[PDB]
Amino acid sequence: DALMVMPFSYVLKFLKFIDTVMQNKTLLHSHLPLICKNLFFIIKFNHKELVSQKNEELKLQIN
Amino acid sequence: TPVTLAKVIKVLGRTGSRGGVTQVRVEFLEDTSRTIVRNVKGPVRENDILVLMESEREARRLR
């Protein structure tokens, strides 16, 4: 429910945070299932708006 | 005054909100992308249309 509640701007901040951990690899390996589950669910919810937006830096983040 | 229309997409449950008031996510009717988390008072269900005097503000919890 929390991941549904949080608004899109906070979703975008969330993706920035995920990129940050990917830079800091060790956390990623420590909590790999958790981050995967949350990231994937948040995208599956806010897909329409996310793809609707255009942002080259966001393309780079997602890549 | 310039008012805006929106379509409800999801009612957000399990958030602890004051009785009678309900959380809700809307996507604007005009442009189908951008979505706001508003509050409503009456009985509301999915996929109906709702009038906003404001677009900028996004609802928070109401204790």
Partner: peptide, 11 residues
């Protein structure tokens, strides 16, 4: 006492 999710956006 906040709510889960609420604390999430705060942090």
């Amino acid at each position: 006492s906040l709510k889960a999710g609420e604390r999430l956006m705060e942090a």
